[PDB]
Amino acid sequence: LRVGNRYRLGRKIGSGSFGDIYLGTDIAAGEEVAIKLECVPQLHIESKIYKMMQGGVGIPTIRWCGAEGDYNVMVMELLGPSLEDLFNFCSRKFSLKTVLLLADQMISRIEYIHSKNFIHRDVKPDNFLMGLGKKGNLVYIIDFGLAKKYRDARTHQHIPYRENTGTARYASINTHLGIEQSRRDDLESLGYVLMYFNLGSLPWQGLQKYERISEKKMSTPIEVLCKGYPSEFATYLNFCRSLRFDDKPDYSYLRQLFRNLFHRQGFSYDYVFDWNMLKFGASR
């Protein structure tokens, strides 16, 4: 069984936003790949977005795009485990060093996507994957199925402020209020992801239910949310919430917050994340 006469098809391994994902092998390489399938529609648009993103650091490479049988098909390099997977392996606790190391790269990925005229609109641990081999310390961003253009390609004219979607847990407050998303919202979602990494859980977890999530988010002060953690996180979230709809975020400032924190703590920029330090042994 071959997709596009080159990629042998395998077991189902996941889902994206709206298609199924299967393991595969480029037998002509020989490389392991991920293959997204879609019943004959959104895959082709996402694939155009992926192609626009090619070349950037931490953007997965598209090996092949096309259609076969009853399916639209996209073939991508298969990467490593998501940040959520790794979070679970590390007992749902990341050290501060690991969080800051992740923050640096994640802010960079979001900035690149913005530099290419798009907003991701679904920033969450499952859409960040680690690389393989010599790129094992590289954070990749995936899934452009909900992505949307925020400014005109030629003029750079920002879209107009408007009314009216991804995962509720990490959604920006503007999103809960039915506001059209922009750059600030990707960055805010990132803030929630980082605090999630610090805490093990967010205070609006385990409470229609989107209304309860929205009101819990709105009723939770940032200084309560970030109690017991370096002030940099509260500063980050406040900055993101303070951005105007069409403002260009100061990505460098946000990265420098976390970097200066990183150095004042004495951590070294090697790439030892917590998951490079797990102990193994016999069945316990």
CATH of residue 245 = 1.10.510.10
Q: Has 247 been annotated as catalytic?
A: no
Q: Is 129 helix (H, G, I), strand (E, B) or coil?
A: strand
Binding-site annotation: residue ranges for ATP: 13-21, 36
List, comma-separated, the residues after which the chain is broken, a break being a C to N distance over 2.5 A; otherwise answer none.
Answer: 40, 164, 207
Separation between Cα atoms, residue 21 and residue 25, nearest integer Å: 13
Separation between Cα atoms, residue 61 and residue 58, nearest integer Å: 9
Query: What is 175-211 written as a DSSP string?
Result: HHTTBPP-HHHHHHHHHHHHHHHHHSS-TTS---HHH
Alpha-helix residue ranges (DSSP H) falling in 22-146? 43-53, 83-89, 96-115
- Measured between alpha carbons, how far is residue 253 from residues 40, 107, 215, 240, 257 in Å? 45, 11, 30, 12, 6
CA–CA gap between residue 224 and residue 199 (Å, rounded):
12
Cβ-defined contacts of 155-164 (< 8 Å, 24+): 158/182, 158/245, 158/246, 161/245, 161/246
Whether residues 109 and 200 fall in one domain: yes
For residue 248, the Cα-to-chain-centroid distance in whole angstroms is: 20
Do 137 and 63 share a structural domain? no
Residue 132: burial class (beta carbons within 10 Å; 0-12, 13-18, 19+)? middle
Residue positions forming the annotated binding site: 13-21, 36
| C-alpha span between 118 and 113 (Å, rounded) | 6
Resolution in angstroms comes to 2.4
Both 109 and 189 in one domain: the answer is: yes
Within a domain: 144 = yes
Structural domain includes residue 5:
no
Could you give the CA distance from residue 226 to residue 218 in angstroms, rounded to a whole number?
Answer: 14
42-47 CB contacts, 8 Å cutoff, 24+ apart: 42/17, 42/18, 42/145, 43/19, 43/72, 43/73, 43/74, 44/72, 46/17, 46/74, 46/144, 46/145, 46/147, 47/74
d(CA 75, CA 6): 11
Check 26, 122, 143, 274 and give the catalytic one: 122
Do 73 and 131 lie in a common domain?
no
Are 75 and 204 in a shared domain?
A: no
Q: Note whether 64 and 112 are same-domain residues.
A: no
User: Peptide bond before 58: cis, by omega within 30 degrees of 0?
Assistant: no
188 neighbors 173 (Cβ within 8 angstroms): yes
Beta strands 148-149 and 128-130: pairing type? unpaired
* Locus of tokens 């093990």: 200
Candidates 152, 159, 118, 167; CA nearest to 246 is 159
Residues 47 and 158 in one domain: no
* Residue 20 β-bridge partners: 15, 37
Phi first, then psi, for residue 72 (nearest 5°) are: -85, 140
Give the structural domain span for 235: 80-281
Give domain status of residue 2, yes or no.
Answer: no
d(CA 54, CA 39): 25
Number of domains in the chain: 2
Are 89 and 64 within one domain? no
DSSP state of 54: T
Buried b (16+ CB within 10 A) or exposed e, 168-179: bbbbbebbbeeb
Using alpha carbons only, give the angle 116, 121, 127 rounded to the nearest 5 degrees. 90
Is residue 59 located within the same domain as residue 165? no
Q: Clarify whether residues 53 and 87 are in a common domain.
A: no
Distance between CA atoms of residues 106 and 129, nearest Å:
11
Q: Judge if 17 and 140 occupy the same domain.
A: no
